[PDB]
Design a protein around this ligand. Structure first.
Ligand SMILES: N[C@@H](CCCC[NH3+])C(=O)O
Ligand SMILES: N[C@@H](CCCC[NH3+])C(=O)O
Ligand SMILES: N[C@@H](CCCC[NH3+])C(=O)O
Ligand SMILES: N[C@@H](CCCC[NH3+])C(=O)O
Ligand SMILES: [Cl-]
Ligand SMILES: [Cl-]
Ligand SMILES: [Cl-]
Ligand SMILES: [Cl-]
Ligand SMILES: [Cl-]
Ligand SMILES: [Cl-]
Ligand SMILES: [Cl-]
Ligand SMILES: [Cl-]
Ligand SMILES: [Cl-]
Lengths: 190, 197, 189, 197
């Protein structure tokens, strides 16, 4: 899909260097090799299987996200690099950062960034139960979107709720976020 | 709409009340369901079938159990009563329709035959203590991708489990696709008995 | 008490299969944290109990496992693959038989009703909240509400027998082991 | 009242503030304390002879107030404090118990983006998990009842063990001669701020 090309020749930065460039609200994107990742890639015809939102606590970099075999969580980006989901190894796939055009000239303690984070925090849960994981992965394969205030989210549905509730509009897969004319690539992580 | 031979085979089958069927059921009978759960629909879509689930009936005396892999749960054995009155701790009937069939080879075989003993042995040997979150995701993903179980692993789609049990007593199912419930329903040796009212 | 099982004959699992009868009482002395909490609060070597159910020649154990659920599974799991570990249950294992069911055949009405009640309580796993509640009740020594379907192992074994008339003298495995009508058969080698 | 320790009197006549008013007074690092009526809460209260069953660390994201904690039937999580007031663990109701705020003496004259506060938060974040499994919940509650601390470099934490790891890694030790909420409440450097109305 047209998000493919947009990231194909983006600069490759080492993780240590990128820390200083990342801003709260930046959009994390991944192309994973996990079975669930592959289902997302097939149904959406994309190289992108995951998305989430970056949140800086001081100098510390966290990723706020819905991970479909896990939950709506907030965790250190370092996990994707060094210990993905208790494997003690790097995420199996490639990793990218982008930034939304509207938030590029907005400081980390702006009103907008505050409300974006607020909404994400409000959706943090304590893991999905077995039933819900099954339901979420099934909706991906069926291409079906979710009920009004049902709280089970595909990664991109979660990124979408947060931006929705600050006005930025984008079913919805990671591809739709990557392909969006207002989403600007920053880097692939080496 | 968009469905196969298994479907017609069960379309005008006699409707029995659960209480009446109990006496007709025999260990090795094949349970079949057409569910409305998201995972049930994914199964129905990818396999182009009304059937989302299958399992093997086991009679302990007068009591009727169902041995099965339930993809959001585990490889378990539980009372058939659950599907009628209390499906997965919901206190309500399974959201879908229910059917019973019998394999031709086991129709003239008594419940303590050596075949039925081996069928039950294998099923018992695969019961687990639930699938972990990772495994449930992987199973449901395979369904959507139409990939069979490609390492020597113990994660089973409902029909895969039923198939392993029968495989290990010499009954093979035309598993052309991988194997979904449809291939069990559609199999020439599988005869319909009833829909449960 | 404890002593009742101390010098009981040690049988190999393969040999015991033929001796077991539906309704036999399974007993364990485990080294798991939850096992030890049961052993402490009840001052006993017994951490677990359950009811044996024979499907033809095959041997199942019907039980409430406090970090899992009210389930029925092959006894073979306790010997070879306890709770997806691919190893034997970390502890020792015993069989007893209740005096009343010794002269009663496997398809008697009593055995039928014992199995009926146990089947009626099988669930699809305990939720996280319920496990915590069960383990907390063990440590607090509190029994359960008559509505509540959350069971300490021994509370489950007790309900089954209660509904066929057999009463046991809150309730931990120790009370079942110690009961004058529960006779030891074997420790599993 | 005689079945209980020094931690208790320290919080008995503390001012009662409405939640809305306390938001402005709270600072990252402040210690949350609860006296719950849940079964697990009672086991904690008995074994530790305390009115306190829970503890956690407050973390401010701008004006929004979060609580970072290990909840023993759930996980090492970070969630809005508002949940304790309006929707505790999906019940849509307030936490069943009483709630308190305290502040450590060392952090009273330290601003919210200090280097210390940064490291406290770093450690907490590093321990956030995706829920405890059924096995671990059982193990944790068992340890509480057995009064045993965590032997290996093990990641299963009683609430106060979590609060203790975060403070330990910025130099603040709590008289842990195992550790329950009581030892945090009773600590001479922990000053009561308010009970939440
Ligand atoms: N959407 C997620 C799926 C996670 C699979 C492994 N936990 C990703 O592609 O990263
Ligand atoms: N194969 C199963 C899927 C599980 C749906 C609910 N747990 C069925 O169609 O019943
Ligand atoms: N009563 C049980 C406790 C659960 C052990 C962990 N699965 C036993 O001693 O075996
Ligand atoms: N430490 C916790 C115990 C578990 C509460 C159950 N939701 C508390 O007292 O709040
Ligand atoms: Cl995978
Ligand atoms: Cl960090
Ligand atoms: Cl991770
Ligand atoms: Cl569903
Ligand atoms: Cl069920
Ligand atoms: Cl343990
Ligand atoms: Cl087991
Ligand atoms: Cl409770
Ligand atoms: Cl909560």
């Amino acid at each position: 899909g047209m998000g493919t090309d947009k990231f194909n020749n983006i600069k490759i930065d080492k993780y240590e260097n990128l820390i200083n460039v990342l801003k709260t609200g930046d959009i994390f994107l991944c192309s994973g090799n996990y079975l669930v990742s592959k289902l997302i890639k097939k149904v959406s015809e994309s190289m992108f299987s995951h998305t989430g939102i970056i949140v800086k606590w001081g100098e510390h970099t966290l990723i706020m996200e819905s991970v479909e075999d896990d939950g709506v969580r907030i965790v250190p980006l370092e996990h994707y690099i060094k210990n993905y989901e208790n494997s003690n190894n790097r995420y199996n796939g490639s990793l990218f950062i982008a930034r939304h055009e509207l938030l590029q000239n907005v400081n980390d303690d702006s009103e907008m960034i505050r409300n974006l984070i607020k909404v994400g925090f409000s959706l943090l849960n304590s893991g999905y139960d077995k039933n819900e994981i099954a339901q979420i992965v099934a909706r991906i394969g069926l291409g079906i979107g979710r009920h009004e205030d049902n709280n089970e989210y595909i990664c991109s549905e979660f990124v979408n709720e947060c931006f929705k509730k600050i006005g930025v509009e984008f079913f919805i897969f990671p591809e739709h976020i990557a392909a969006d004319h207002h989403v600007l690539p920053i880097a692939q992580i080496e």
